Design a protein around this ligand. Structure first.
Ligand code: HEM
Ligand code: HEM
Ligand SMILES: Cc1cc(N)nc(CCc2cncc(CCCN(C)C)c2)c1
Ligand SMILES: Cc1cc(N)nc(CCc2cncc(CCCN(C)C)c2)c1
Ligand SMILES: C[C@H](O)[C@H](O)[C@H]1CNc2nc(N)[nH]c(=O)c2N1
Ligand SMILES: C[C@H](O)[C@H](O)[C@H]1CNc2nc(N)[nH]c(=O)c2N1
Ligand SMILES: [Zn+2]
Lengths: 413, 409
């Protein structure tokens, strides 16, 4: 591959030069003959595979702390070696773990919020042994990160994978989601996306309130055991009721959302170690709720009802009635959240901040991988600066990765 | 391998077999994806297999593979490349190759129309004056008094690079951009440089906001020459809003005919360096990009004024609100003037049905998500949720250098 690749911003004519792609460790799905850039998703590591992966990460860590080739660098390397050789694995020091987590976020090509990458509270839960223990650790995460509305980004890292039969997993794809219930008549109450998961919870013994906005319990799996249900204390789940600054009727829609966005289904990869339960949280970009959660057809799908209360001509599509409502909805989302002093960023601010971030990363690190398809907001795309920004996408390690759904893989005891 | 593409709204899965038939690179590799890069990066021996394969797919597409018609044609092309280092397409082959370059255009959301293409063979052309006549007839035909019709005009192929036919205008119809003293820019800032080349060539500009640039036509490697399209041929739409009576007072208008004239049509290893093609507008091209891009007409702020919007924080989404109203007015104007136009909801809806057709009958449809998804209201259109595979099928429209960077006078 060529040593320097060039990206161009077509609005400002600014050109950036990427050398960091040279450090790419994983495949993208693309080949020279086909591009998968818009495909959403394109038993354990052996001693021989583990050795070079660990060394790679160790070198990189001591390179970050400006002690490359130092006595402590060679000593850490030999210790990790000795350990992989005797135990087929090794354990990260707390410093390495925190560095690894921060960088996994730094390398997350789909995340537009990465300007904040180095401010990340890391909770080491590697001593956890039970699901009740996971529940404790998670509750602490939530209360900390929520911070009464002034959100702070946090990750909680549970023990690494060992033999594959003793995985820690959060079954919830996100820590906080609303239930979805499928009626006999074919309609769906709640959040239709979560119908399968809700069903799982119900089977496990969850008594459903059958409402539009019922917070799902946690379904926690420790040490490869069957998962266990727990209810998050409602006092720990901060929510924002949606209202509109101009339209007083908007509040009559009975809408609300949760303040804390937190992913719990991904796998954290550091130095060849796999952390299968590593829930992380930041704060919301308005469009995530106002556009996707609310306006996707297989989600809350409120465009129609909102348009009606707006007295919009809805026979032609060229009236653009869908669009007009969308903007209002997203205004009401940012307004509710700010009025309740819960941290939220609009899509203009977030994308602007990301460009400055990207530019700085090219300047200091020789590149910044980015997935244009994910980075560009799902509304008003071209009036945000990222739309006109060329981006190279490649996978750096440490990383957050996808993993199969646990209910597809679990061997029920 | 057979690849699957999933729409994440309907859960429809399509199996792509077509991609196995491609041979041009996309620029990506296993480790680096360049799907958001806009411009990623012929002898007798080179030319023949290219020629061979294309004749092969033509006789395959018309169900006469192995026929004597097929055989002779293969022998005919052989002898002609042999003795002239090039070869000439049959008319039927020209029309197929044009329609199929459109069909293979991964960046075009309009492809459901691909087989309804009017093809004007201008390969007998020899002078700029010729090109100008051919182009005027194109324009008049395709405009059709508002009921637009897809057209392409194809000039003589490349032979030796030194005798290239080129339309210097990136598009057939665009407005002039003027660089003011005070540093502001009049007209369309994107054309500023070209506008000034035209002036430097003898063009007397009216220095207004919407001045139709003249045609700059290069024939057979020669210096390009200026020609003004007759005004009566250039259909234009005044932009008014249905509810906002003040919108007319913004003084906005656009041309009704979108016609790309800077690309290269490639067929059977032949290079048609001059091949303007035209269609009709999707409303967002004008309403979003042309008008609201900071580097273009940049009307967003001015519009936001007249809507009496709070423009202090971005979180008031005032830019968004003004944008939707601009695009309503555009659609509304064209429609009121019986000028053909498609809204991005219908356009994207059409593209999805087209993808179904292509998978059903052809085993896939190359598509560039970055270009297919409209520049506004992305996820409330069907294609945002549609996985698409991009790959390069031939015949194709490729980019080419700007002529004012390679032409010797
Ligand atoms: C601090 C403020 C943050 C903001 C404003 C932000 C913003 C976003 C947005 C808008 C998305 C797209 C989400 C979607 O459409 O599903 C996203 C995705 C993502 N973010 Fe961030 N994020 C933040 C924090 C974090 C943190 C703390 C981490 C990890 C430590 C992270 C890693 C990721 C990853 C891995 C994805 C991909 C999600 C997926 O593949 O499903 N982000 N982020
Ligand atoms: C008939 C109705 C058509 C519609 C609604 C349509 C729609 C569009 C749109 C919206 C774009 C993006 C334009 C931009 O962002 O600059 C595009 C690109 C494109 N179209 Fe179509 N188009 C149509 C006809 C055609 C025809 C007749 C051809 C060729 C014979 C064609 C070939 C292409 C190509 C090659 C591109 C890529 C342009 C580039 O690379 O800059 N289209 N189309
Ligand atoms: C760290 C982080 C920050 C942020 N702004 N958003 C996220 C994703 C938030 C999120 C919350 N509830 C539900 C979802 C579902 C997304 C569904 N996608 C994967 C199809 C996503 C994560
Ligand atoms: C065939 C065709 C159909 C269509 N609907 N749009 C187009 C684009 C036409 C077009 C007209 N004037 C100006 C432009 C500028 C494009 C600017 N891009 C290249 C940066 C483009 C072409
Ligand atoms: C098909 C396509 O890849 C898919 O709909 C993507 C598009 N871009 C996205 N971007 C973000 N941030 N989140 C998403 O879920 C998606 N979905
Ligand atoms: C950076 C990116 O490649 C560039 O801005 C592209 C994005 N998608 C686009 N899509 C269309 N239809 N037209 C464009 O000009 C662009 N520009
Ligand atoms: Zn790619």
């Amino acid at each position: 591959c060529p040593r320097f690749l060039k990206v161009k911003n077509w609005e400002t004519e600014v050109v950036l030069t990427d050398t960091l792609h040279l450090k790419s460790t994983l495949e993208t799905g693309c080949t020279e003959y086909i591009c998968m850039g818009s495909i959403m998703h394109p038993d354990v590591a052996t001693k021989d595979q583990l050795f070079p992966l660990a060394k790679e990460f160790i070198d990189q860590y001591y390179s970050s702390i400006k002690r490359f080739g130092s006595k402590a660098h060679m000593e850490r390397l030999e210790e990790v070696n000795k350990e992989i050789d005797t135990t087929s694995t090794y354990q990260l020091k707390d410093t390495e773990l925190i560095y690894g987590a921060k960088h996994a976020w730094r390398n997350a090509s789909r995340c537009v919020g990465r300007i904040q990458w180095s401010k990340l509270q890391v909770f080491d839960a590697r001593d956890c042994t039970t699901a009740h223990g996971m529940f404790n650790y998670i509750c602490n995460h939530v209360k900390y990160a929520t911070n009464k509305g002034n959100l702070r980004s946090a990750i909680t890292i549970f023990p690494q994978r060992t033999d594959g039969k003793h995985d820690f997993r959060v079954w919830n794809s996100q820590l906080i989601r609303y239930a979805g219930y499928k009626q006999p008549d074919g309609s769906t109450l709640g959040d239709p996306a979560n119908v399968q998961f809700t069903e799982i919870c119900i089977q496990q013994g969850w008594k459903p309130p059958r409402g539009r906005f019922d917070v799902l319990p946690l379904l926690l799996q420790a040490n490869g055991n069957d998962p266990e249900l727990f209810q998050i204390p409602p006092e720990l789940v901060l929510e924002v009721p949606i209202r509109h600054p101009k339209f007083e009727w908007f509040k009559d829609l009975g809408l609300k959302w949760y303040g804390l966005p937190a992913v719990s289904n991904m796998l954290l990869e550091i130095g060849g170690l796999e952390f299968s339960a590593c829930p992380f949280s930041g704060w919301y970009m308005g469009t995530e709720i106002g556009v996707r959660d609310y306006c996707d057809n297989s989600r809350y799908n409120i465009l129609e009802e909102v348009a009606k209360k707006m007295n919009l001509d809805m026979r032609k599509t060229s009236s653009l009635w869908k669009d007009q409502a969308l903007v209002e909805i997203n205004i009401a989302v940012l307004y509710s959240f700010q009025s309740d002093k819960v941290t939220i960023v609009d899509h203009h601010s977030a994308t602007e901040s990301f460009i400055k971030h990207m530019e700085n990363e090219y300047r200091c690190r020789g590149g910044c991988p980015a997935d244009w398809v994910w980075i560009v907001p799902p509304m008003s795309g071209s009036i945000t600066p990222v739309f006109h920004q060329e981006m190279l996408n490649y996978r750096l390690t440490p990383s957050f990765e996808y993993q199969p759904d646990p209910w597809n893989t679990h061997v029920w005891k």
